[PDB]
From a paper:
By revealing the evolutionary history and loops appearance of GH19 chitinase, we discover that one loop which is remote from the catalytic site, is necessary to acquire the new antifungal activity. We demonstrate that this remote loop directly accesses the fungal cell wall, and surprisingly, it needs to adopt a defined structure supported by long-range intramolecular interactions to perform its function.
After we confirmed that the tree topology did not change based on the presence/absence of loop regions in the MSA, we used the tree based on the unmodified MSA and selected five ancestral nodes where InDels of the loop regions occurred, designated Anc1 to Anc5 based on the presence/absence of loop regions in the extant sequences. Overall, the backbone structures of Anc4 and Anc5 were nearly identical (RMSD of Cα = 0.478 Å) and the orientation of catalytic residues is similar, suggesting that loop I and II addition/removal did not cause major structural disruptions. The loss of the hydrolytic activity in Anc4 via loop I insertion might be due to the lack of disulfide bonding between loop I and the core scaffold. However, it is worth noting that the addition of loop II to Anc4 did not improve its antifungal activity. Anc4 and 5 differ by 45 substitutions, suggesting that loop II enhances antifungal activity in combination with residues in the protein scaffold.
Residue numbers in the entry: 0 to 218
Write the structure that this text describes.
Amino acid sequence: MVSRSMFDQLFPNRNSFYTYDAFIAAAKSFPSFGTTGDTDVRKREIAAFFAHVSHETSGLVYIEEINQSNDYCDPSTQYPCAPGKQYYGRGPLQLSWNYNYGPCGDALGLDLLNNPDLVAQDPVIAFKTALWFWMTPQSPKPSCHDVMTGNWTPSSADLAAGRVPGFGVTTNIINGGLECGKGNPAQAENRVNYYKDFCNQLGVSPGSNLDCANMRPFG
């Protein structure tokens, strides 16, 4: 794991909300994060997670999505929207939509469906929501964790679609419908730029298959 001082090197401008101790506590909740594979692989995973976080929150400066005009409610019997609440982006990976706050809360033992603001109020919970997304396979997508740590077996369909192991597939999992394939490559390039910078700081290679312009979104 990166030291306290390295966390400050990687996130020099972050809001004080996002403490190293809160990150470490959240990570203890997901003990395979950053501890799977050889030490270079562990650093690539950490760098990849932090690169997406840095993209989504401008270096852990932001906690909440700026535009709060939209409730991000897709009516659901399984994950019903709470009256008066909104599911706009919160936390390091900008958890969004009732149908993600629901399962995320269930995984963390929290009622995030009815108290979605909690993700922007408790930093351990904030980091746990991001690690939940990173660590959890959600069919048909593997977890970003498994992709980066050599534990994902792409299907034959994945290979034919260009979904090969590396950072690019993580962008695809996170937002490939808009950022990969024929999409405008600007946002994916920003993610890769953070990733390459963080890998350089940690002394490892970014590895192969970084871009996602040559892959289709998952089904």
